[PDB]
Design a protein around this ligand. Structure first.
Ligand SMILES: [Ca+2]
Lengths: 11, 61, 223, 96, 131
């Protein structure tokens, strides 16, 4: 859980 | 007072009373509400937290 | 302060007015001898006016004390307003009572979302000019650095933060510079600059005082 | 403005004490505030996640719940405090 | 979200959209495993509604999305609809979500977990970007 395959990119 | 409306008004039994309207409205509070909070849903459940020494007129007859 | 409220006399007892024959900046009393303000408020011959509420009326709780030293941050950059902090030493110790009191410096940088009190005698209008007699106050949150940079791309240094309302309508304004942003009883900010006042997407920008606590200590200790 | 495309915002958790500066007694123990930082959850966000890293992993700390009637980005959004509710979550999952 | 930014598509794979039977989004949710979504109690989710997982662009009809029927709504009985306290509902899905790159679970905290004031967290959703 909680670990996206597609990593979020946040500014 | 007679302008916006409140179906569900609760007041303390003091003189003067401390009254609030606990109506939930969708998406905004009534026109006289100074302090409005809403859920972030669609529709938004909005609640006026104002305390007044009166109840607004009922919405329903 | 635009969109604020009258503070109430002496309810912001660390707020001072910096006067050179007229109120030109605020400041914050940080102990009996020292006021923090903005380096862009630097001028010769500052008179610090403490215990003011109505700055145009002698009401009886004022202390007017001349600056003996006005020490701008040595890396103050007047072009970008980076390190926009100054310390003013009072020629004589202010008399600290309920109406004149120092404000604590931060022990840590406040986090974004923390509500602050910004006060001053600056313009109360976002377009046009109306200077209040009495001290105005505004509760405003610290905005996240990303919001601040988004609002002011290329202009927000690590020594700055935004506070206020992206929707506009509430901000500090000209005449507030130098004055306090106090959050949970600590001076986190100094009124510094903005694009206009109270404009949408243009929150006030504040000198990040928590970055200067050592410099403040040092300057106080050295003067 | 409603978005077709999933949006995100970083925003700080507030202490319930800081949040109360804005919301007063509305703030209950099963709530956690976040934002008042130049972003706001807004209508249609409700029920969605407020997540924080816990040892590299995104962990549901809040559920978008309520706040400014105008989604003011200078007022904290209030989220259901998942730590306060997760026991109920686990018990419901267990029973079902 | 006002003043957020568009997510990387699929990068919040637990984010679901709660839609009515027409595809109208009215709330978000988070997958906590294949069979359960956690959402706000005040959203008023019913078994007529659907959990849509895997969406990025709700204007797009070409994403591998999963429209998941809700078998059962579990509103926290402590939910107070006036104070919005205990504002949580679990949705048990009629059919398990198929986890993939764009669909998977968020972690649940322990009740004792400390997420300190000041922590930068993230919220996601398709709420209004401008009020
Ligand atoms: Ca005076």
């Amino acid at each position: 859980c909680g670990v996206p395959a597609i990593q979020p990119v946040l500014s | 007072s007679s302008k916006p409306c409140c179906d569900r008004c609760e007041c303390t039994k003091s003189i003067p009373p401390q009254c609030r309207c606990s109506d939930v409205r969708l998406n905004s509070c009534h026109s006289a509400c100074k302090s409005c909070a809403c859920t972030f849903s669609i529709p938004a459940q909005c609640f006026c937290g104002d305390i007044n020494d009166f109840c607004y007129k009922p919405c329903k007859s | 302060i635009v969109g604020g409220y009258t503070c109430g006399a002496n309810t912001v007892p660390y707020q001072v007015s910096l006067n050179s024959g007229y109120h030109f900046c605020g400041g914050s009393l940080i102990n009996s001898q020292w006021v923090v303000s903005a380096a862009h408020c630097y001028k010769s011959g500052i008179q610090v006016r403490l215990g003011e509420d109505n700055i145009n009326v002698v009401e009886g709780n004022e202390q007017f004390i001349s600056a003996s030293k006005s020490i701008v941050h040595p890396s103050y950059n007047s072009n970008t307003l980076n390190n926009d902090i100054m310390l003013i030493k009072l020629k004589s110790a202010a008399s600290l009572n309920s109406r004149v009191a120092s404000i604590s410096l931060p022990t840590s940088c406040a986090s974004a979302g923390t509500q602050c009190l910004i006060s001053g005698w600056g313009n109360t209008k976002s377009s046009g000019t109306s200077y209040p007699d009495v001290l105005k106050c505004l509760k405003a949150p610290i905005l996240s650095d990303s919001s601040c940079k988004s609002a002011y791309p290329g202009q927000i240094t690590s020594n700055m933060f935004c506070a206020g309302y992206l929707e506009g309508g509430k901000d500090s304004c000209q005449g507030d510079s130098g004055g306090p942003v106090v959050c949970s009883g600590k001076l986190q900010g100094i009124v510094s600059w903005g694009s206009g006042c109270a404009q949408k997407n243009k929150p006030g920008v504040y000198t990040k005082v928590c970055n200067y606590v050592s410099w403040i200590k040092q300057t106080i200790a050295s003067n | 403005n409603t978005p077709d495309r999933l949006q995100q915002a970083s925003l700080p958790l507030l202490s319930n004490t800081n949040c109360k500066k804005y919301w007063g007694t509305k703030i209950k123990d099963a709530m956690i505030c976040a934002g008042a930082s130049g972003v706001s959850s807004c209508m249609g966000d409700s029920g969605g996640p407020l997540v924080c890293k816990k040892n590299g992993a995104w962990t549901l700390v809040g559920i978008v719940s309520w706040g400014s009637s105008t989604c003011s980005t200078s007022t904290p959004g209030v989220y259901a405090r998942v730590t306060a509710l997760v026991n109920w979550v686990q018990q419901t999952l267990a029973a079902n | 979200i006002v003043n957020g930014e568009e997510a990387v598509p699929g990068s919040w794979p637990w984010q679901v959209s709660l839609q009515d039977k027409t595809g109208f989004h009215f709330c978000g949710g988070s997958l906590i495993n294949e069979n359960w979504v956690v959402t706000a109690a005040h959203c008023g989710v019913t078994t007529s509604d659907v959990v849509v997982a895997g969406e990025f662009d709700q204007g797009s009809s070409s994403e591998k999305i999963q429209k998941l029927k809700i078998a059962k709504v579990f509103k926290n009985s402590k939910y107070n609809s006036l104070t919005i306290n205990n504002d949580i509902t679990l949705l048990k899905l009629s059919t398990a979500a198929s986890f993939s790159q764009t669909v998977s679970a968020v972690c649940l905290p322990s009740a004792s977990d400390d997420f300190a004031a000041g922590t930068t967290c993230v919220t996601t959703g398709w709420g209004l970007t401008r009020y």
